[PDB]
């Protein structure tokens with residue numbers, strides 16, 4: 001994957017790990033960088049545009065928890081303008097096990113919904129060009145932080161969903177892979193307050209900076225491997241192998 | 251685990267797997283067996299009672315998609331009556347990838363919510379007695395039926411959640427294990443929808459391969475309950491009961 005002159009939609013582009021990935025992406029001479037986030041950060045947005053003014057950066061206020069139909073309405077406006085979109089990056093997410101419904105709505109349901117929305121524009125069965133989906137999941141989708149069981153479970157779901165998307169690529173023309181960051185250089189809520197110090201404890205352990213998580217993120221996008229399950233931990237980029245415990249035979 | 255004299259709540263006890271599990275459960279001399287299901291089934295209820303009149307069987311009309319406060323209200327009613335509950339079984343699920351929100355609400359969120367509610371009565375930090383939770387997940391939580399990605403993902407979520415619950419037992423006093431059937435002959439798999447109709451023949455193709463009976467599944471389910479192994483990930487496929495080992499890809503070190 002050569003990112004030059006490509007059109008990219010990035011959901012939650014101006015947050016923590018999103019912003020540093022975004023900074024590197026706009027340095028790659030994209031034609032369009034389309035940002036969809038819940039709230040505007042005008043300082044960050046201006047800063048992004050200044051990195052390379054030639055890149056068309058557009059911002060849409062977007063809540064990932066809206067129904068599929070609402071996401072399709074926004075996407076139609078984007079496709080009407082750009083004509084083509086090459087990659088969708090899903091980076092929405094919250095970490096707060098005091099918010100059970102919302103954790104699920106944002107991290108899991110929202111990810112499924114926006115994917116379903118864009119498939120209506122990309123599905124090759126209906127004359128669509130196909131496309132690429134990069135889902136920001138989490139290493140907690142492989143093995144949980146058991147003190148944030150709801151967060152971890154939501155990430156396990158999207159690791160699964162991404163895996164299946166990739167296996168459906170021959171039918172849909174839409175490839176996908178997951179980007180799974182380890183702990184990246186603040187305090188949050190554990191489920192039923194089983195551990196009030198999760199953030200303090202995790203951030204003391206060996207971590208990585210948001211800078212070369214973002215650099216490894218772009219490397220992963222460039223590698224463009226359907227069905228990859230990328231681990232981005234301790235400043236390295238590694239593809240993990242999913243264990244086969246069971247087979248549907250279909 | 252001796253089931254004699256125990257109090258059991260079973261969410262979704264009257265479906266294909268549920269009813270056959272229930273038939274086996276009441277073979278043991280349970281004290282109270284409390285059924286929560288979405289639709290009343292007076293014939294099945296009568297049948298179970300007849301199996302073992304020593305077991306006290308009650309029924310509540312219950313939808314897992316209600317807010318947690320509502321589930322808490324029902325549990326309080328039950329705990330006030332029985333004083334103690336020994337085991338909770340969370341068995342609700344739908345298979346319909348035309349229903350994204352509902353699949354996730356029933357299969358994942360609803361399971362998390364009943365668990366969260368019952369912890370209020372059981373949590374040893376509150377001076378509760380602890381307890382045991384058996385969660386019906388799915389082999390699809392290990393490896394998807396990719397033509398139903400949403401269902402499979404919802405099951406992956408609950409496998410994860412159950413693993414974590416079990417790891418929290420030393421703190422909460424509440425142990426847990428997953429029950430993961432393979433393809434089992436019930437109405438669930440008779441006819442169903444794939445995501446965006448990627449595979450309109452999915453039910454046909456799946457059932458062209460070997461399956462097990464709900465009877466076999468229910469027998470092995472109760473066997474796993476009696477084994478009572480915290481953190482177990484039980485596979486119930488082709489008539490066998492087998493514990494699987496979850497691969498370690500990453501460790502939080504906490």
Ligand SMILES: NC(=O)c1ccc[n+]([C@@H]2O[C@H](COP(=O)([O-])OP(=O)(O)OC[C@H]3O[C@@H](n4cnc5c(N)ncnc54)[C@H](O)[C@@H]3O)[C@@H](O)[C@H]2O)c1
Nearest residue numbers: 262264265266267313314341342343388431433434436438
């Ligand atoms: N049949 C299989 O091959 C298979 C394989 C693996 C896992 N499972 C799982 O086993 C469980 C039982 O499935 P089944 O095969 O007996 O299917 P079923 O359709 O016969 O029964 C589903 C059960 O879930 C209940 N339910 C559905 N929605 C509910 C709601 N909103 N609130 C409360 N209860 C609700 C139903 O009333 C019923 O008791 C499900 O969780 C399913 O995902 C089934």
